[PDB]
Design an enzyme around this catalytic site. Structure first.
Site, PDB file in Angstrom:
ATOM      1  N   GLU A   1       0.796  -1.209   0.000  1.00 60.76           N
ATOM      2  CA  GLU A   1       0.000   0.000   0.000  1.00 60.76           C
ATOM      3  C   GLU A   1       0.836   1.270   0.000  1.00 60.76           C
ATOM      4  O   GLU A   1       0.483   2.236  -0.707  1.00 60.76           O
ATOM      5  CB  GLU A   1      -0.985   0.028   1.177  1.00 60.76           C
ATOM      6  CG  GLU A   1      -1.957  -1.134   1.174  1.00 60.76           C
ATOM      7  CD  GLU A   1      -3.015  -0.977   0.110  1.00 60.76           C
ATOM      8  OE1 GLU A   1      -3.081   0.134  -0.494  1.00 60.76           O
ATOM      9  OE2 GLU A   1      -3.786  -1.943  -0.103  1.00 60.76           O
TER      10      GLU A   1
ATOM     11  N   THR B   1      -8.869   5.218   1.868  1.00 62.82           N
ATOM     12  CA  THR B   1      -9.376   5.832   0.630  1.00 62.82           C
ATOM     13  C   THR B   1     -10.910   5.967   0.732  1.00 62.82           C
ATOM     14  O   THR B   1     -11.584   4.937   0.814  1.00 62.82           O
ATOM     15  CB  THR B   1      -9.027   4.984  -0.582  1.00 62.82           C
ATOM     16  OG1 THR B   1      -7.623   4.694  -0.596  1.00 62.82           O
ATOM     17  CG2 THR B   1      -9.363   5.736  -1.903  1.00 62.82           C
TER      18      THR B   1
ATOM     19  N   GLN C   1     -14.256  -0.696   8.931  1.00 61.16           N
ATOM     20  CA  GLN C   1     -13.362  -1.045   7.818  1.00 61.16           C
ATOM     21  C   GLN C   1     -13.514  -2.471   7.329  1.00 61.16           C
ATOM     22  O   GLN C   1     -13.703  -2.711   6.121  1.00 61.16           O
ATOM     23  CB  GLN C   1     -11.903  -0.646   8.118  1.00 61.16           C
ATOM     24  CG  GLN C   1     -10.953  -0.629   6.876  1.00 61.16           C
ATOM     25  CD  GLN C   1     -11.547   0.148   5.703  1.00 61.16           C
ATOM     26  OE1 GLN C   1     -12.142   1.227   5.891  1.00 61.16           O
ATOM     27  NE2 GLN C   1     -11.422  -0.408   4.509  1.00 61.16           N
TER      28      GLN C   1
ATOM     29  N   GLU D   1      -8.429  -4.239   3.090  1.00 58.10           N
ATOM     30  CA  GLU D   1      -7.912  -3.307   2.055  1.00 58.10           C
ATOM     31  C   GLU D   1      -8.800  -3.200   0.855  1.00 58.10           C
ATOM     32  O   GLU D   1      -9.151  -2.088   0.478  1.00 58.10           O
ATOM     33  CB  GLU D   1      -6.525  -3.739   1.605  1.00 58.10           C
ATOM     34  CG  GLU D   1      -5.525  -3.803   2.772  1.00 58.10           C
ATOM     35  CD  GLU D   1      -4.943  -2.430   3.103  1.00 58.10           C
ATOM     36  OE1 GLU D   1      -3.857  -2.367   3.705  1.00 58.10           O
ATOM     37  OE2 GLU D   1      -5.525  -1.381   2.728  1.00 58.10           O
ATOM     38  N   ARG D   2      -9.120  -4.346   0.251  1.00 63.25           N
ATOM     39  CA  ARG D   2     -10.075  -4.404  -0.872  1.00 63.25           C
ATOM     40  C   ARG D   2      -9.774  -3.466  -2.077  1.00 63.25           C
ATOM     41  O   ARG D   2     -10.661  -2.723  -2.511  1.00 63.25           O
ATOM     42  CB  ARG D   2     -11.493  -4.147  -0.347  1.00 63.25           C
ATOM     43  CG  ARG D   2     -11.841  -5.099   0.825  1.00 63.25           C
ATOM     44  CD  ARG D   2     -13.313  -5.048   1.212  1.00 63.25           C
ATOM     45  NE  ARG D   2     -13.783  -3.686   1.456  1.00 63.25           N
ATOM     46  CZ  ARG D   2     -13.822  -3.128   2.665  1.00 63.25           C
ATOM     47  NH1 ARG D   2     -13.420  -3.830   3.717  1.00 63.25           N
ATOM     48  NH2 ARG D   2     -14.295  -1.897   2.839  1.00 63.25           N
ATOM     49  N   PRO D   3      -8.539  -3.508  -2.619  1.00 61.60           N
ATOM     50  CA  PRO D   3      -8.203  -2.641  -3.761  1.00 61.60           C
ATOM     51  C   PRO D   3      -8.852  -3.128  -5.071  1.00 61.60           C
ATOM     52  O   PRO D   3      -9.325  -4.272  -5.148  1.00 61.60           O
ATOM     53  CB  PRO D   3      -6.669  -2.724  -3.815  1.00 61.60           C
ATOM     54  CG  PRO D   3      -6.356  -4.073  -3.323  1.00 61.60           C
ATOM     55  CD  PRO D   3      -7.403  -4.360  -2.235  1.00 61.60           C
ATOM     56  N   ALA D   4      -8.918  -2.249  -6.074  1.00 61.21           N
ATOM     57  CA  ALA D   4      -9.548  -2.600  -7.363  1.00 61.21           C
ATOM     58  C   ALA D   4      -8.976  -3.908  -7.867  1.00 61.21           C
ATOM     59  O   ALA D   4      -9.717  -4.791  -8.280  1.00 61.21           O
ATOM     60  CB  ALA D   4      -9.347  -1.492  -8.391  1.00 61.21           C
TER      61      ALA D   4
END
Ligand SMILES: CC(=O)N[C@@H]1[C@@H](O)[C@H](O[C@@H]2O[C@H](CO)[C@@H](O[C@@H]3O[C@H](CO)[C@@H](O)[C@H](O)[C@H]3NC(C)=O)[C@H](O)[C@H]2NC(C)=O)[C@@H](CO)O[C@H]1O
Length: 159
Positions: free
Chosen positions: A45, A71, A106, A137-140
């Site tokens: 990250e 974010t 979160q 986190e769960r990013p794209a």
């Protein structure tokens, strides 16, 4: 001693920060495995840098900021400001994470593990890295196996 900046940290710099985080969260009930799972994420990250803005785009509060790339950054900065903590600060960001565990923020339970289970877990740093990736986190892009490699690296290289 910690590094706090809007720049990517070298491996040596990350190690200083990573040991600090391990010491801090160990006093607050987290296992070394759980901390290293998270550190493996924080390395991807932010290079484990509390000062880092997504894309190095300083001041863009719509984008990611800090160790775990909150974010929008305002999700965290608003909280620190409201809590009278300096936002660009290692301990303030660790306090946010502790606040999130305590208030079930979160985390989304996608892997049949709650945030409270997570911090007490002695599953491997790789496994916990992947759980933290998916739940917190769960990013794209979900395909970042390197986070588990990094988690295992910190588990071996820190005390
Ligand atoms: C370009 C890119 O991938 N940006 C990354 C961010 O996506 C990522 O932050 C995380 O973004 C996801 C998706 O917006 C957030 O999950 C959402 O959270 C809200 C809670 O308000 C919830 O309503 C949604 O259901 C949920 N969506 C999904 C798909 O799960 C998540 O909270 C963000 N994570 C954090 C720590 O704030 C960050 C961090 O991985 O990286 C950017 O590069």
């Amino acid at each position: 001693m910690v590094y706090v900046s809007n720049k990517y940290l070298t491996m040596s710099e990350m190690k200083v920060n990573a040991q600090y985080i391990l010491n801090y969260l160990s006093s607050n009930g987290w296992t070394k495995q759980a901390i290293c799972g998270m550190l493996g994420n924080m390395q991807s990250e932010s290079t484990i840098n509390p000062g880092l803005w997504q894309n190095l785009d300083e001041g863009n509060t719509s984008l990611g900021f800090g160790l775990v790339q909150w974010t929008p950054a305002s999700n965290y900065i608003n909280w620190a400001n409201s809590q009278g903590l300096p936002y660009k600060n290692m301990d303030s960001e660790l306090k946010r994470i502790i606040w999130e565990v305590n208030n079930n923020a979160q985390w989304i339970n996608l892997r049949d593990m709650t945030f409270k289970e997570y911090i007490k877990s002695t599953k491997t740093p790789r496994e916990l890295a992947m759980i933290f990736l998916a739940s917190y986190e769960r990013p794209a892009n979900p395909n970042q196996p390197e986070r588990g490699d990094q988690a295992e690296y910190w588990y071996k290289n820190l005390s």
